[PDB]
Structure formats: C-alpha cells, structure tokens
Amino acid sequence: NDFYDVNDFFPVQVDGIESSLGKYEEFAKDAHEWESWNLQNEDHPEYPVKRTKIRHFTLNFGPQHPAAHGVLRLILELHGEEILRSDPHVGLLHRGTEKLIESKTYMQALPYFDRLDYV
Amino acid sequence: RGILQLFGPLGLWKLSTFISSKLNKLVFLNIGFILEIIVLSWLLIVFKVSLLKYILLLIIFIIL
Numbered sequence: 213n214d215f216y217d218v219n220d221f222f223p224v225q226v227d228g229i230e231s232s233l234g235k236y237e238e239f240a241k242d243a244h245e246w247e248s249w250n251l252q253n254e255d256h257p258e259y260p261v262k263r264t265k266i267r268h269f270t271l272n273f274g275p276q277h278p279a280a281h282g283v284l285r286l287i288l289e290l291h292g293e294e295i296l297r298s299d300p301h302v303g304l305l306h307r308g309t310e311k312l313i314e315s316k317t318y319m320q321a322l323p324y325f326d327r328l329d330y331v
Numbered sequence: 332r333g334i335l336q337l338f339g340p341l342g343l344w345k346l347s348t349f350i351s352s353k354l355n356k357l358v359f360l361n362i363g364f365i366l367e368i369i370v371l372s373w374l375l376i377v378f379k380v381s382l383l384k385y386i387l388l389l390i391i392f393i394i395l
C-alpha cells in the first residue's frame with residue numbers, strides 16, 4: 213500500500229510434528245519461548261516481512277546552488293549515487309511576461325524579450 | 332502401578348519434560364546471552380577447585 217509493503221522450492225506438506233516427549237500440540241502453549249520450536253523459516257520468499265516504505269534520499273539541487281543558472285528546485289531522487297527520477301521545478305522565475313505583454317503596445321513589448329535570455 | 336511407575340516411565344517422563352523445558356529456553360540467538368556465560372566460565376579458573384561441589388549444587392538450584 214502507501215505506508216509499508218509485504219517461489220522455486222516445492223510447497224512441502226509437513227503435518228504431525230512430534231518430539232520425543234509428546235506431540236506438537238501438547239507443548240504448543242509453551243513453545244513461543246523456545247526459539248528452536250518456531251515453524252516459520254526466515255528464508256522463505258512467502259515469509260511475512262512487513263517493512264515501512266522509507267523514502268529514498270531526495271537531495272534538493274535547489275535554488276542556492278552555483279550550478280543552477282537561476283532558481284531551480286531540481287528534486288532528484290537517488291539511491292546510492294545513481295539517478296532514479298528527476299522532477300525539475302521551474303516557475304521560481306515566472307515573472308508573468310506573457311500576461312504583461314497583452315497590456316502593452318508592440319513597441320513597448322520589445323524590451324520584455326531582452327529579459328528572457330540574459331545573454 | 333504405583334511407586335514402580337513413579338520410579339519408572341511415568342515418573343521419568345515428568346522429570347525429563349521439566350528439565351527439557353528449562354533447557355530449550357537457553358537456545359536462543361542472542362550475542363549478549365552467550366557473552367555472559369563465556370565470562371561466567373572464567374570464574375572456574377579463579378575459584379579454588381575445592382569449591383566445585385558448591386557450584387554444582389547452585390547450578391541444580393537454578394534449574395528449578
């Protein structure tokens with residue numbers, strides 16, 4: 213689901229567990245203490261392992277980075293040092309040029325274009 | 332069917348079940364558990380060997 217998550221060898225039918233001093237059910241109400249009496253091996257692929265979904269290291273290649281040519285919140289999701297998913301967050305410099313040009317003449321709208329690319 | 336069964340298969344099944352119940356608790360994966368017994372056994376070297384019978388008496392007491 214959202215917060216946590218939960219074969220080759222034959223499924224082997226074994227029933228009628230017995231010891232030398234009785235049956236499995238005779239000492240069932242006492243064997244939880246006995247760690248050597250458990251019937252759920254930990255190598256089984258179907259063994260119930262319930263582990264929380266701890267999110268991966270998501271460094272922010274954020275606005276305050278010299279590599280950034282502006283203000284870019286580059287949300288990088290990385291495991292180890294490889295790159296899994298990248299979601300750039302543009303808009304930290306949305307001055308709304310397209311909205312302002314609609315209210316200014318064709319001569320007055322020219323200086324807006326020099327401010328698109330600084331170079 | 333009386334004392335010779337208490338001093339026999341029926342009586343010895345109780346004693347074996349009692350002792351084997353205590354033992355099966357000891358076998359459990361724990362580094363701290365196995366560490367103390369190793370350190371505890373170092374007391375055998377320290378004690379004068381005239382005191383082995385007392386440790387044997389004490390060890391039986393802890394079984395209970």
Ligand SMILES: CCCCCCCCCCCC(=O)OC[C@H](COP(=O)(O)OCC[N+](C)(C)C)OC(=O)CCCCCCCCCCC
Pocket residue numbers: 233339340341342343344345347
């Ligand atoms: C010095 C004189 C020597 C004489 C011979 C030795 C004594 C006879 C013992 C026979 C027991 C038997 O046969 O074990 C059979 C018994 C129980 O029987 P069960 O099948 O579980 O039936 C009972 C079923 N209940 C209980 C579920 C109702 O199992 C045991 O307790 C296993 C441990 C046996 C310990 C043997 C120690 C021997 C020490 C001998 C030196 C003192």
